Design a protein around this ligand. Structure first.
Ligand SMILES: CC(C)CCC[C@@H](C)[C@H]1CC[C@H]2[C@@H]3CC=C4C[C@@H](OC(=O)CCC(=O)O)CC[C@]4(C)[C@H]3CC[C@]12C
Ligand SMILES: CC(C)CCC[C@@H](C)[C@H]1CC[C@H]2[C@@H]3CC=C4C[C@@H](OC(=O)CCC(=O)O)CC[C@]4(C)[C@H]3CC[C@]12C
Ligand SMILES: CC(C)CCC[C@@H](C)[C@H]1CC[C@H]2[C@@H]3CC=C4C[C@@H](OC(=O)CCC(=O)O)CC[C@]4(C)[C@H]3CC[C@]12C
Ligand SMILES: CC(C)CCC[C@@H](C)[C@H]1CC[C@H]2[C@@H]3CC=C4C[C@@H](OC(=O)CCC(=O)O)CC[C@]4(C)[C@H]3CC[C@]12C
Ligand SMILES: CC(C)CCC[C@@H](C)[C@H]1CC[C@H]2[C@@H]3CC=C4C[C@@H](OC(=O)CCC(=O)O)CC[C@]4(C)[C@H]3CC[C@]12C
Ligand SMILES: FC(F)(F)c1ccccc1-c1cc(C(F)(F)F)c2[nH]c(C3=NOC4(CCCCC4)C3)nc2c1
Ligand SMILES: [Ca+2]
Ligand SMILES: [Ca+2]
Lengths: 855, 114, 27, 28
């Protein structure tokens, strides 16, 4: 080993055997920087980006990287990047160096005319040919579990040219599958890029590398031209990263293109197309694969594609999924019990499994248990497309989720169900980013459903409502509207279509928007009018008002010792209301505040009855008091009742947003009251031994002070001794502490300013501040209150084959519109000027051809 | 050991101190100091010791710090008047304590900024 | 400008046609 | 030590992003 690491230090295949077993595992891929590192290299940003991306790709694919390791120029930076990435599959950077250029040489030795690069994990010493032989052997190596038809595909990268670089390029080319890649910028790489005649070669070589040539002799430059001719013989192996290119993932595209060309040109793998498709699936190359394979319609029946298809689903390659579907694939036939079982058993993450467990145990829902039992049924060993969509969405595969959703028949229903599932999963929170992504995707699906329903309603208003009323068809327990409600989809229910449907339903058979007052005046043809929810609500309101009137009359005018029949009728009416609430008890009765309040009122009423029937004065008086207190709740129920006014409901709902401001106001007021009351009471009175008066003079009087009442016992002139009592044997406050002369003792210049400040703070400043806060609050949350009221309107109202094909047609039109929507804008011309240069190039080629013709 | 719990305990202790101060000031304020008022003195000096730790920083930079120093000074002056044992003197001491109670209570506004 | 670049391609097409015609003339 | 190198990596990525950001728009 070495200190700054094993060094074989062998002289010029056998090394690979030891390397495979002793040190590290075998390579799915390998990469080589054939070009050496100059003493001074131009490290401009583009080079840094290219090589950082190359190293990241190598880590992603897990390939060895070969470099000189002299610690000069490029290799220094590559080693630094490799070290930084490894510290933060794994990358391995093997290096080779000749003893000639090593400055210090020692035999667990430590190291201080080139200096070895520190970042390289392994280094080799020789007493360049060994590199070529090793590359040839690694290429010749045969592995069965290879998608490249074995041979361990190799790619060689060239950054800067030179004598050694050209020799390495030539020797690599002589061997097959070199897959050399040359970048745009370089001393000699630019020559090769430009070429893809002795005079033209000489011109290019001189212009790109002027100075070095003059030193070289004529024979040597002729030999170099011969070498370049040999390289230029076969252009298919060469690949160039053009300078003008500035997009992302350029390195991956270049590597994939070079490897695909090398594989295709084998002349014995050409017949096989599955290998090429798999290779183009490993690297994200959609356009190239589509153009080369699927366009020709050559040799595939589309039946075997299933295999490749499966891989895509597990490798998150949605574009290839879409390509397979477009070119012919029956997802219904492809999806089988065995395929789904394989997908759920192994490819399904166990983190999502335990998350499903926790979500189900924490809360019970129909759809959660449905999906849970479905996944258990699949794992242990009927709309399979829905199962695939659920699998895709659960794992948070955004693009594949959309691609799969495009196939489902229940478009809007599927979107709403996916949104509900995502929200339920987000309820179980363990990571911030996971919950954020879940809620973002749920919102996106909600918006998509809203747009789809807008189109549905626009095309056919009468039948679009049938979709909402239409059942699941085995999709889930609830239908579209209930599913939206469960997920709290304020956006979906707040749109004009759903509100119009709710209004039309609530008005009932009565012609909509005839007139509001005519229906009130009106209070088989009659049955339709009498069965509308509007009329039932009106009757209930009238009955409740009459009940309140009767309750008040019994409470005030006629409340005798022995219950009268009228009070018995009142009891019957209240118990009838209790029976009515028994129906609503089925739902989340204790979830809402008004329900618990009504239960409390009923309990108080029955307790008051118990006191009423005792027939004792002290008991039935308390019963009357109980009834009086219950009347307050019974009357205040009208606020809840009248939330459907369309004019008062929003304002009533707005009250829920003022609680924070009210609490702040009360906090400040209470603090000031306590301080001022304690101060005054201590200042201008002696010891008090009556608890009630302590709170009556510390809390009550300052509380009244805000209502314009001014304290009286603060000024000697104003203070009157008639009210006060010297001793505690009375029911009026204790007298002010006196002096030996029998006069008030308080200074009178301490209390008055204190009261002035307190009154200024309470009466004026605090209330104005509260008004300002209320104004800002009503201004800020005006729009959201409308959505909240519309959402609650659903509950308030509900308190009292061909369609499928038409939906499919509308959805197909919508999909065709959206897919081509990006092309509709067509605000980009670079795409289009790109077309122009081809004509100029062809014209220049024809001009050169005709020039050759004449001469 | 969480800061949340420590803050809760401090708030509870301060509220109990205010209640005790009010009870001593209104119901039980006799000519000769009672043991309960001695406990009140001990609690206030404990709060002073607690503020001794924060004295290291820019103590006079902020308003609430100078206000607490003022309250402590007023409390000790009120003690001086309290111990004279003269009616005209201990009455003024009671007035001093009443005025100090206002600041001690108003500290809650600063306390509840979190 | 797409409207207007559209005008450019006509000149290139005519020039290519004339180039092919003259090439046929010489050969 | 490791945190320092990770910060260096993140900063290098950020610098490469910002330096080429002007070219990303390519509205000219
Ligand atoms: C002892 C009783 C017979 C005397 C009470 C007289 C009025 C105070 C009552 C009788 C019928 C009541 C009305 C019955 C039905 C309605 C409709 C109701 O809903 C709406 O108007 C808007 C609903 C929507 O827009 O969707 C509002 C109250 C109103 C006018 C009620 C308000 C009070 C009215 C006028
Ligand atoms: C004096 C005590 C012993 C008996 C009850 C006094 C009445 C004057 C109270 C009982 C029920 C109250 C009514 C309950 C419901 C309504 C409807 C409410 O809203 C509307 O009229 C229209 C609502 C809409 O536009 O949507 C206005 C107050 C009113 C008449 C209330 C005002 C005063 C009423 C008639
Ligand atoms: C910003 C301003 C508008 C608010 C405060 C202004 C006045 C309402 C306050 C400030 C100081 C106060 C004065 C402070 C001291 C006294 C003397 C006081 O009389 C005594 O001190 C005699 C004591 C005794 O007889 O024992 C009567 C009120 C007065 C003028 C106070 C009455 C109200 C004053 C002028
Ligand atoms: C001699 C008598 C008649 C007059 C003096 C008695 C009170 C009126 C004094 C005693 C303590 C004073 C208080 C000490 C602290 C504060 C908090 C201060 O506001 C803040 O808390 C925020 C400070 C900031 O913004 O930094 C405003 C004045 C007030 C109530 C002071 C104003 C006047 C008070 C209540
Ligand atoms: C004599 C004592 C025992 C009776 C006092 C009863 C209540 C008035 C006290 C007891 C405990 C106090 C609580 C202790 C801790 C806190 C948390 C504290 O901070 C927060 O809630 C928000 C902090 C953040 O969000 O970061 C606010 C006050 C509160 C509820 C305190 C407010 C008043 C409480 C409820
Ligand atoms: F809306 C409001 F808040 F009034 C206010 C609005 C705008 C500007 C300032 C204030 C404000 C703030 C505070 C503080 F932020 F400091 F709390 C105040 N404190 C006091 C007093 N303190 O004690 C008193 C009551 C007990 C007896 C002694 C006098 C009144 N008046 C304030 C006015
Ligand atoms: Ca109810
Ligand atoms: Ca402090």
């Amino acid at each position: 080993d070495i200190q700054f690491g094993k060094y074989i230090r062998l002289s010029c295949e056998t090394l690979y055997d030891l390397m495979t077993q002793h040190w590290h595992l075998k390579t799915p891929n390998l990469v080589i920087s054939v070009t050496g590192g100059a003493k001074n290299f131009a490290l401009k940003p583009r080079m840094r980006k290219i090589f950082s991306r190359l190293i990241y790709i190598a880590q992603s694919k897990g390939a060895w990287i070969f470099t000189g390791g002299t610690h000069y120029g490029l290799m220094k930076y590559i080693g630094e990047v490799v070290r930084d990435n490894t510290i933060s599959e794994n990358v391995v950077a093997i290096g080779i160096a000749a003893w000639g250029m090593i400055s210090n040489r020692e035999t667990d030795g430590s190291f201080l005319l080139y200096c070895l690069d520190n970042n390289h994990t392994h280094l080799l010493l020789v007493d360049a040919k060994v590199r070529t032989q090793l590359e040839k052997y690694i290429s010749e190596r045969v592995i069965p579990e290879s998608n490249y038809g074995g041979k361990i595909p190799i790619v060689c990268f060239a950054q800067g040219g030179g004598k050694e670089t050209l020799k390495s390029i030539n020797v690599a080319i002589k061997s097959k599958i070199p897959c050399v890649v040359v970048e745009g910028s370089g001393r000699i790489a630019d020559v090769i890029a430009s070429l893809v005649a002795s005079s033209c070669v000489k011109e290019s070589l001189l212009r790109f590398l002027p100075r070095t040539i003059s030193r070289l002799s004529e024979e040597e430059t002729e030999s170099w031209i011969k070498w370049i001719k040999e390289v230029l013989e076969s252009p298919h192996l060469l690949t160039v990263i053009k300078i003008e290119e500035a997009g992302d993932e350029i390195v991956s595209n270049a590597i994939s293109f070079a490897l695909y060309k090398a594989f295709s040109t084998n002349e014995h793998d050409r017949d096989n197309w599955n290998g090429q498709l798999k290779l183009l699936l490993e690297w994200n190359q959609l356009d190239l694969a589509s153009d080369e394979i699927f366009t020709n319609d050559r040799n595939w029946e589309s039946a075997d594609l299933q295999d490749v298809m499966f891989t895509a689903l597990v490798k998150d390659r949605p574009k290839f999924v879409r390509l397979f579907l477009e070119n012919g694939l029956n997802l219904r036939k492809f999806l089988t019990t065995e395929v789904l079982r394989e997908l759920y058993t192994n490819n399904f993450s166990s983190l999502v499994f335990k998350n499903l467990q926790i979500a189900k145990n924490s809360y019970n829902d129909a759809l959660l248990t449905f999906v849970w039992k479905m996944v258990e049924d699949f794992r242990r060993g009927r709309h399979p497309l829905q199962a695939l969509f659920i699998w895709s969405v659960l794992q948070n595969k955004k693009e594949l989720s959309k691609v799969i959703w495009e196939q489902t028949r229940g478009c809007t229903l599927a979107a709403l169900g996916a949104s509900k599932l995502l929200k339920s999963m987000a309820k179980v929170k363990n990571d911030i980013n996971a919950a954020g992504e879940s809620e973002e995707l749920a919102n996106e699906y909600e918006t998509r459903a809203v747009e789809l329903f807008t189109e549905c309603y626009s095309n056919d208003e009468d039948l679009a409502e049938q979709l909402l009323t239409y059942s699941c068809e085995a999709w889930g327990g609830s239908n579209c509207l209930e599913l939206a409600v469960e997920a709290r989809d304020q956006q979906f229910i707040a749109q004009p279509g759903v509100q119009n449907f709710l209004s039309k339903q609530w008005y009932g058979e009565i012609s909509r928007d005839t007139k509001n007052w005519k229906i009130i005046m009106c209070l088989l043809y009659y049955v339709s009018f009498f069965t509308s929810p509007f009329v039932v609500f009106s009757w209930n309101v009238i009955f409740y008002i009459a009940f309140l009137l009767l309750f008040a009359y019994v409470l005030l005018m006629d409340f005798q010792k022995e219950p009268t029949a009228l009070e018995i009728i009142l009891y019957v009416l209240v118990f009838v209301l209790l029976c009515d609430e028994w129906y609503m008890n089925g739902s989340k009765y204790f979830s809402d505040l008004w329900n618990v309040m009504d239960t409390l009122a009923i309990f108080y009423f029955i307790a008051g009855i118990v006191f009423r029937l005792h027939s004792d004065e002290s008991s039935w008086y308390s019963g009357r008091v109980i009834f009086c207190l219950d009347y307050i709740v019974f009357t205040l129920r009208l606020i809840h009742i009248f939330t459907v006014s369309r004019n008062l409901g929003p304002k009533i709902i707005m009250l829920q947003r003022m609680m924070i401001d009210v609490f702040f106001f009360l906090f400040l007021f209470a603090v000031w009251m306590v301080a001022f009351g304690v101060a005054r009471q201590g200042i201008l009175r002696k010891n008090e031994h009556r608890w009630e008066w302590i709170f009556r003079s510390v809390i009550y009087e300052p509380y009244l002070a805000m209502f314009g009442q001014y304290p009286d016992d603060i000024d000697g002139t104003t203070y009157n001794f008639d009210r006060c009592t010297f001793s505690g044997n009375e029911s009026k406050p204790l007298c002010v502490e006196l002096d030996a002369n029998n006069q008030p003792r308080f200074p009178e210049w301490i209390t008055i300013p204190l009261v002035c400040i307190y009154m200024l703070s309470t009466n004026i400043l605090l209330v104005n501040l509260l008004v300002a806060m209320f104004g800002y609050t009503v201004g800020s949350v005006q729009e959201n209150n409308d959505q909240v009221w519309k959402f609650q309107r659903f509950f308030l109202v509900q308190e009292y084959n061909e369609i499928l094909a038409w939906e499919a047609v509308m959805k197909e039109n919508y999909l065709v519109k959206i897919n081509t929507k990006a092309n509709d804008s067509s605000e980009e011309m670079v795409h289009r000027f790109r077309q122009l240069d081809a004509k100029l190039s062809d014209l220049k080629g024809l001009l050169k051809e005709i020039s050759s013709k004449i001469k």
